[PDB]
Amino acid sequence: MELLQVLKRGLQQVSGHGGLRGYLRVLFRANDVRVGTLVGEDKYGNKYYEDNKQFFGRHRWVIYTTEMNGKNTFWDVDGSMVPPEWHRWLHCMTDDPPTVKPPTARKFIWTNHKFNLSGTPQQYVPYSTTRKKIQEWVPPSTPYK
Amino acid sequence: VYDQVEFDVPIGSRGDCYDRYLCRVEEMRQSIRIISQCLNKMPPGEIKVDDA
Amino acid sequence: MFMINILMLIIPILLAVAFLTLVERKVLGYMQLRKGPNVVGPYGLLQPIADAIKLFIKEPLRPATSSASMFILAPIMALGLALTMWIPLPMPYPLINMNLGVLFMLAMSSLAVYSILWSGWASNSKYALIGALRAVAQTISYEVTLAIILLSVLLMSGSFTLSTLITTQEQMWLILPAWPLAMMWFISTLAETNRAPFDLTEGESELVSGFNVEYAAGPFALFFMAEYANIIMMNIFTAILFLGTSHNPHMPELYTINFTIKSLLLTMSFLWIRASYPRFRYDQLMHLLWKNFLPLTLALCMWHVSLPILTSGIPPQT
Amino acid sequence: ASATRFIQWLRNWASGRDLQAKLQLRYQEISKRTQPPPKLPVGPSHKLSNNYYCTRDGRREAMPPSIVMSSQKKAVSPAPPIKRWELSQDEPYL
Amino acid sequence: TYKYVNLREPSMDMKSVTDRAAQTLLWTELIRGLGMTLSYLFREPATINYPFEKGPLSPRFRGEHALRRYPSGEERCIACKLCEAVCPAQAITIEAEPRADGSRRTTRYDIDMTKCIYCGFCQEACPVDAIVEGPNFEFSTETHEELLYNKEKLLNNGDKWEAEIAANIQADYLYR
Amino acid sequence: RGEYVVAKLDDLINWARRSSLWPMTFGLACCAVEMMHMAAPRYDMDRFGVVFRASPRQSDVMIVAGTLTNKMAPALRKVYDQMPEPRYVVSMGSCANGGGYYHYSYSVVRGCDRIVPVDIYVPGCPPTAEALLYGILQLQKKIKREKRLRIWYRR
Amino acid sequence: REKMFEFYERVSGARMHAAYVRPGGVHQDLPLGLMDDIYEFSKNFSLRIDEL
Amino acid sequence: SKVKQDMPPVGGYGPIDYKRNLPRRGLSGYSMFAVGIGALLFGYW
Amino acid sequence: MNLMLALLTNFTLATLLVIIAFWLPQLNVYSEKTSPYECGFDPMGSARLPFSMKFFLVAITFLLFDLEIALLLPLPWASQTANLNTMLTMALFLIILLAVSLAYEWTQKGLEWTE
Amino acid sequence: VRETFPEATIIKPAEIFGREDRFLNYFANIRWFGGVPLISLGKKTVKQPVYIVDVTKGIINAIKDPDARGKTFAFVGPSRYLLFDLVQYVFAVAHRPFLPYPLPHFAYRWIGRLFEISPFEPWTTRDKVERIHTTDKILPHLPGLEDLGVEATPLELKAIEVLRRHRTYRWLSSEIEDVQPAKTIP
């Protein structure tokens, strides 16, 4: 009976997440208990998974780290936490993960990725990047008059 | 290249919302019919006019 | 002990109503190839709690043009009468055993219509008034057919007591000998509860929100709870009328389990129907009842007066 | 694709169609998200000779309108009457 | 060629007339509609688990702008102002002067991201691939001012996103 | 300790409010099409508790999804004022953000923030449906950070 | 519609406002693999019309 | 190298349906009414 | 006493929820907020203006038909009579006359709304 | 303030009326208690309320006016009213029934403490009762709004703007000229 096999698959998911505690963690953090193949992990702690039997769109996913750049992200996660090298693979712009097709290294590329900083003291504030256009006459500092 | 593809124009008989709804549904089917011919008859070559 | 019995009636009703809202959103979601709530609590189980708290800490508005007293009265009437509709329901024992329980439910349903009329009129705004007058049209459409449909069924049961329907259906569901009446009853309950494809007093795509368009926050929540309470109650009424459950006096919980399953499935069918059909035009609803159900209902009322007499199967008075 | 046999039968029966043959969710039949590089062709003007621009200059062939009448025999219509359409042979009536 | 969408006369034989009466009285066609929504209830939903799963995109996707560098670290932009000229929204503002080493470089490069229509004309017009639209689309802000990008912001975007941008350009430059 | 009690009550009202955001059924132009795709099955906004309701009396969020013209500006302000509080405004797309392609037109309001206060700006022309969803989840986190009861306690 | 938005995005980089058809032709040639995916979409679409 | 762009497969793509297909299901009108009356009579008895 | 208690509790509970709704939330009342709703534009004319009823004749017919059910509701009890010959004839007579009355209003175009 | 910052401009407004004031709105909100209590029936108190926009324009001119540095201004309205006449005008403009009754000072104070119990924003207080029944000082020696170029706005022209929302549906549309003004203490 398939209805018995379905229960085993769902019961297997509890062991695939390392017990009930790990299962409940992913259930409450990501609202999804599927088990996939660990494609890789980035230096911030994000873990990347695939299951190619899932339909297109659900076949790749990230479990975000619980802390990033000194911020607690156990409950507060956002798509901007995905670093650029994994961003391409997660959005299916490429087939190759950065574990296989590493990005080209440059001396100016950020070593540490930053998430969206709006609403924090690190937010961007616009300003004019050009210098003063008109130089004003400065009167002398002595009374000759 | 619409003169090179075969499709049917749906026509209503009562000029009401229901007939106009049927015409739009049948136009979707004909669009799929046209798309099929475009997929098979796509030619090679450049995609903008060779005139810089 | 009776005061405790009352609280063990209306608190569960309110909880069932809250979680019906989740179920409708999930059921509609999956029929629409999506999921519905699945974030707020696991599988969305906390979603109703967030909505209720949200509404009751939201600012209520009394419109400048509104009739203050009637504006406040109407939502109180809606919820208070929605709860009242439950007290005579045999599940299998009623909280209040009534001689004319069916006649009590008809009267309480008629009174509840005024919570739509007065809220719409008291709002003093055009979309609210249009919604209220649609309720006048809706009641005119279904009320006569609804009472006569009940009469025909009660000519097989013999009384207006709701517990007698349990006795009547001990051997066989009444849907067998009265499936034509069950069909017309089912549609009438959809019109009675202002449900799709008869959701005209609200008629979102047409009237924004119809009669309750000026209501916010807690007062709005009262109308919402009343509506979903009536959806469940009307489908419990249907289960008792046509799918009677067997009652073992020594194991009354077996009745309750069986009767609850039937009530849930009938409630699901309301959600199913809402996902499937377009909306009637409110004049077309009137013509449905008066030109189709009423002729058939009159004929079947004649048939069910004669059938017991000619078959010598008249039910007992007691 | 993971639906059990019973569920496949249930929705097949309810819909009245064999839904498994034309699923609306995409799986492995789609194109790979990495593709080999292209090698696009060039157009008809990519030549090293017999290619003077003046001989293929569409813009310079445009002319001002032809003045037919200004204020400085059989009757005609703008064009022949339109030919009557034919009924479709693929499916004349829906 | 044309076809009629609604031009058919129902058969008036006894079986057909009784088939239509059953449909009217027993609601057969309405029951059929219930079957369709029922079949959908038991289909896997199309929903993806955002932000843990993402909608697919291609290398051509036009997102947040960035200013790029050569492998040496020098800026690609040489202040030609082609992007500023072509911008359909006039969202680009540029000032330039000789750099302290004589290089032709900008002293202002602003993109008003609330003017911009994200059309990609600027990256088509650029002769050196200096200005691009990157793949980022998750940069909503809390204030309007945060979307008025100056050159420092755009260079940081390039440094932040270059690893992905260069791989995307590699995938699509033979189509350009 | 009152500080502890008000802190927990803040979490509850914040959680209830962000978990049940009901945007007003209100859209202006092409950005409203991407808003439809956020309600469509792939993203299913309703799964976050985000549900459109037509009446402003029953709405918590106004998503300004499209160009705001001078002729439309009074009606937008009207229906925003008729929203009970707390209420939030999400500006979606270049037109709503600052005028966009039509910034220099004689008939266009250069940003909806001249008419109403704005909590989140979603960039794009249009923002993708995912971009809009990112903006809604950003609004949720802004509501999560609110300190209404903690500030009242220290008044 | 969401699947057809992807076709827009794959040729132009935009889901809606492609700015792809221009005087002279189109902006860019179809990426490799696009016509197979359009064919896969079109194979099943008529069934979706049948359900509507 | 040779030209390489997106093209149809050599034989063309497989057939694509487009014509309306709403299959015919259900019992005859006679059979449905006969079952309905049969249930009525069993109920009455 | 049980019935009266049950009614009092139901409407007391509803009234309490309305009291909480009005005294719990933070209010911010001003003119534009409480103005009547008409899709963002000011209403033209009062909502108290007459609103023509196009089904006025069906509404009046409802009053007469609504009273027929009051005559018919006792039918389950009347079926307990020994005088079933009279009761059945009179029961059918009333329903038939209701059907005739419906047929008349139907044929004379009384169920069609005024245009 | 005058000691820490000798060059400060110090502005001394009377009770300020406006849409979001706690003045005209305060009187109009007494209607929920039926009658309107008043110390000595409001015949012993005089007020000279000033419009919010006048105070605003006076502040803005003080910033731009070099002569305003180090000065102290008094911003008062054009007219002085008896507290009884003012409240009577408020209820006339709002078309609410006006039932003034006398309440002695000690009684009014006791109720003031009653409303001070509220941990939120008290509807009234003992201190508030005192200030409402305090006579508005006459300070001829101080410069006023006219010294900064502002022309004081009469309460008769702006009361409807504040008090229209305090009416019922019956009286919402009543025009500005329908109510006769209040006796101004010449």
Ligand SMILES: CCCCCCCCCCCCCCCCCC(=O)OC[C@H](COP(=O)([O-])OCC[N+](C)(C)C)OC(=O)CCCCCCCCCCCCCCCCC
């Ligand atoms: C189906 C039934 C569901 C019912 C659910 C009922 C809600 C359950 C959750 C309760 C959470 C606590 C309520 C907090 C919400 C308060 C609204 C708010 O946010 O205001 C912010 C305000 C903030 O005020 P503020 O002083 O900081 O500034 C506001 C003024 N301006 C605009 C000028 C800045 O908080 C308060 O003022 C008081 C907070 C008190 C918290 C304790 C609540 C006591 C409630 C009793 C009120 C007394 C009247 C009786 C009401 C009935 C009593 C039940």
Ligand SMILES: CCCCCCCCCCCCCCCCCC(=O)OC[C@H](COP(=O)(O)OCCN)OC(=O)CCCCCCCCCCCCCCCCC
């Ligand atoms: C021994 C002799 C015995 C003598 C007695 C014999 C009696 C049996 C034979 C008589 C016929 C029995 C069936 C009667 C059922 C009622 C029929 C009916 O009124 O429906 C027809 C109605 C007509 O409307 P229309 O199709 O638009 O055109 C009419 C033109 N004037 O069309 C409609 O009403 C359509 C309704 C639209 C709303 C439907 C929305 C819900 C649809 C799903 C419901 C599924 C049924 C669920 C039933 C559950 C019951 C628990």
Ligand SMILES: CCCCCCCCCCCCO[C@@H]1O[C@H](CO)[C@@H](O[C@H]2O[C@H](CO)[C@@H](O)[C@H](O)[C@H]2O)[C@H](O)[C@H]1O
């Ligand atoms: C517009 C005006 C329309 C007027 C319509 C009037 C319709 C009347 C139709 C006849 C209905 C009654 O038909 C009649 O019913 C009674 C029972 O009630 C039957 O009576 C039979 O059974 C009863 C018991 O039930 C016995 O007491 C009686 O001795 C026996 O004859 C008659 O055998 C039958 O002839």
Ligand SMILES: CCCCCCCCCCCCO[C@@H]1O[C@H](CO)[C@@H](O[C@H]2O[C@H](CO)[C@@H](O)[C@H](O)[C@H]2O)[C@H](O)[C@H]1O
């Ligand atoms: C004793 C109870 C059982 C018996 C049933 C009692 C009710 C009988 C109702 C009979 C109605 C007959 O008279 C009715 O008049 C109108 C004329 O306006 C007829 O014709 C008109 O109405 C029908 C439906 O509205 C339309 O399809 C038709 O185009 C229109 O001309 C109806 O087809 C006819 O049914």
Ligand code: SF4
């Ligand atoms: S994408 Fe288009 S609108 Fe935006 S800066 Fe570039 S050229 Fe201007």
Ligand code: SF4
């Ligand atoms: S970004 Fe490119 S196009 Fe724009 S000024 Fe610099 S070099 Fe020129």
Ligand code: SF4
């Ligand atoms: S921002 Fe772009 S997509 Fe949105 S309304 Fe304006 S032009 Fe249309």
